Structures are given as structure tokens and as C-alpha cells.
Write a protein that binds this ligand. Structure first.
Ligand SMILES: O[C@@H]1[C@@H](O)[C@H](O[C@@H]2CO[C@@H](O[C@@H]3CO[C@@H](O)[C@H](O)[C@H]3O)[C@H](O)[C@H]2O)OC[C@H]1O
Ligand SMILES: O[C@@H]1[C@@H](O)[C@H](O[C@@H]2CO[C@H](O)[C@H](O)[C@H]2O)OC[C@H]1O
Ligand SMILES: *[C@@H]1O[C@H](CO)[C@@H](O)[C@H](O)[C@H]1NC(C)=O
Ligand SMILES: O[C@@H]1[C@@H](O)[C@H](O)OC[C@H]1O
Ligand SMILES: [Cu+2]
Length: 235
């Protein structure tokens, strides 16, 4: 159970985004139904009044929280991967439009899942804004908690992988457009019951055998990290 409070750009807090530049749902409940329209941007997908201005090459940091800002972030039981997608805003997230900019699942060196490191990062994870056309975009951050992912929701709706999905409205002002955005995947649609990484047993299968769901990260993506960029207790 987790939500996005807001974003930072190049280490500068853009302020509370909830229902303002984030298409915030009403609470921190997970999405579990892989075929629902809630998979696109969570249960309250509507245009909110502001979009955060960035330029290509900027560092865009999402900041998650559990109940209040900069708390325990998300229960430590909720091991799993983190991904970030982008789509043009004119799509409203419909169609084959979501392009993956970032994926982190299990780090063999530190023996930690993305979620574990997200907690340590005080909720913060970043992507570098790609050199796409200037314009309005949706950035879709997705945490997949795997503590009940040994079962399929479609078979047992008490269990299943849990998706914590947040869409931010971002405007890219300056960019050379050196890597035009390609077409992507649909949400819902990309993930199905037989997609790798959706059904998995984290208690008995080594985390080193986990494969995150496709699609793979786009070759135009400029990377990102799970790491604190700013101190919420100061600003
Ligand atoms: O010993 C192992 C068991 O622990 C494992 O059981 C899972 C433990 O986590 C359960 O999910 C909880 C649901 O309620 C949330 O508030 C908690 O944060 C979650 O941890 C899950 O339902 C159990 O299957 O099974 C394998 C054993 O080896
Ligand atoms: O100079 C920046 C401001 O531009 C920034 O304003 C953010 C931008 O993104 C969204 O529109 C949000 O609603 C605004 O508050 O705030 C931080 C400041 O340093
Ligand atoms: C999943 O959502 C789809 C599309 O809205 C819906 O038809 C189906 O009833 C849902 N399944 C469950 C178990 O709620
Ligand atoms: O539903 C509960 C939610 O209110 C809380 O914020 O996180 C734990 C959940 O079980
Ligand atoms: Cu939860």
C-alpha cells in the first residue's frame, strides 16, 4: 500500500502533486485485475489541472509514501520490481503507447529487491527525461508487490500480484528530439496471466531467477536509479 506524493526535478521539490499534477487515486489500495482499465493510471484516471515542466536530460524523481509523507513508504513484505513508462498525453494512456524507460527488479550484489531499496531511499526513484519531442506526456510509475503473486488474481481474487500505479503529467519544454518516442505497449493488455514476472513465488524460488515482465527498456532511455535526491523533512 503506497502512493505518490509528488515529484522533484533536478533535485528541486515541485510540491504536493496529489490531484494536481498526479492523477491520484483515493487511497493506497492496489490494482490487481490485469484486464481492468485501472491498470492504465489507477482507479481515478482523469486530467488534473497542472503539468510539471521539464527539459530533456532532467532528472525526474517520484516520491512515494504509505500514510504520510516520508514515512515507512511501503510495507517491507511487499518485495518486488519497479518500472517507469512514458506515453504521449494525447493518447490518455490508451492504445499501444507505453514505452518503458526504467526497470529494476533484484540486485544480486546487495541481495535486495527494488522495493527494499525504495524504502531506504525514502520513497524516491528517478528517471532521466528522454530526448523526445517537446509536448505533454504521462509518466507511469509502477511498483509490483509479489508477496501474494504465487497465485493469479484471475483464479483467486484474494491473492495475486499487486500493482501500485501512478501517472504524473509532465510537459517536456526543450528537447532536441534526438530519440523520437516509438510505439509501446497497452495497459491494460501488456501483462497477462502467463507473462513472466506476474506469477512468481518469492519464498521458495531464488530471487536471482526472477524475470520482470516485458517489455524491455527502450534503447532511447537514459537510465535512472532508486536513491534519495532530496530531504523531504527540510523542503
Ligand atoms: O513462511 C513463508 C510464508 O510467510 C509465506 O506466506 C506469505 C506471507 O505474506 C502474506 O501476505 C501478507 C498479507 O497481509 C499484509 O498486510 C502483509 O504485509 C503481507 O505480508 C502472504 O499472504 C503469505 O502467503 O508462504 C511461504 C512460506 O515459506
Ligand atoms: O521554480 C520551481 C517551480 O517551477 C515549481 O512549481 C511546480 C512545477 O510543477 C507543477 O506545475 C507544480 O504544480 C508547481 O508547484 O515549484 C518549485 C520551484 O522551485
Ligand atoms: C477484471 O476487470 C475486467 C474489465 O473491467 C472485468 O470485466 C472483470 O470482471 C474483472 N475481474 C474481476 C475478478 O474483478
Ligand atoms: O488498508 C490498509 C491501509 O489503510 C494502510 O494505509 O496500509 C495498510 C493496509 O492494510
Ligand atoms: Cu500493501
Amino acid at each position: 500500500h503506497t502512493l505518490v506524493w509528488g515529484v522533484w526535478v533536478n533535485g528541486v521539490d515541485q510540491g504536493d502533486g496529489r490531484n494536481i499534477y498526479i492523477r491520484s487515486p483515493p487511497n493506497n489500495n492496489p490494482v490487481k485485475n490485469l484486464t481492468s482499465p485501472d491498470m492504465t493510471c489507477n482507479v481515478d484516471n482523469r486530467v488534473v489541472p497542472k503539468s510539471v515542466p521539464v527539459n530533456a536530460g532532467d532528472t525526474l524523481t517520484f516520491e512515494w509514501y504509505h500514510n504520510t509523507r516520508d514515512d515507512d513508504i511501503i510495507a517491507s513484505s511487499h518485495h518486488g520490481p519497479i518500472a517507469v513508462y512514458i506515453a504521449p498525453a494525447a493518447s490518455n494512456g490508451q492504445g499501444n503507447v507505453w514505452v518503458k524507460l526504467f526497470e529494476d527488479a533484484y540486485n544480486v550484489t546487495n541481495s535486495t529487491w527494488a522495493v527494499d531499496r525504495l524504502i531506504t531511499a525514502h520513497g524516491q526513484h528517478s528517471v532521466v527525461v528522454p530526448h523526445v519531442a517537446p509536448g505533454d506526456y504521462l509518466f507511469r510509475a509502477e511498483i509490483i508487490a509479489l508477496h501474494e503473486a504465487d497465485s493469479l488474481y484471475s483464479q483467486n481474487p484474494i491473492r495475486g500480484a499487486q500493482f501500485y500505479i501512478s501517472c504524473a503529467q509532465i510537459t517536456i519544454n526543450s528537447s532536441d528530439d534526438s530519440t523520437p518516442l516509438p510505439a509501446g505497449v497497452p495497459f491494460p493488455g501488456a501483462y497477462t496471466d502467463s507473462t513472466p514476472g506476474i506469477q512468481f513465488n518469492i519464498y521458495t524460488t531464488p530471487a536471482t531467477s526472477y524475470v520482470a515482465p516485458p517489455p524491455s527498456v527502450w534503447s532511447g532511455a537514459l537510465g535512472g536509479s532508486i536513491a534519495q535526491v532530496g530531504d523531504a523533512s527540510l523542503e
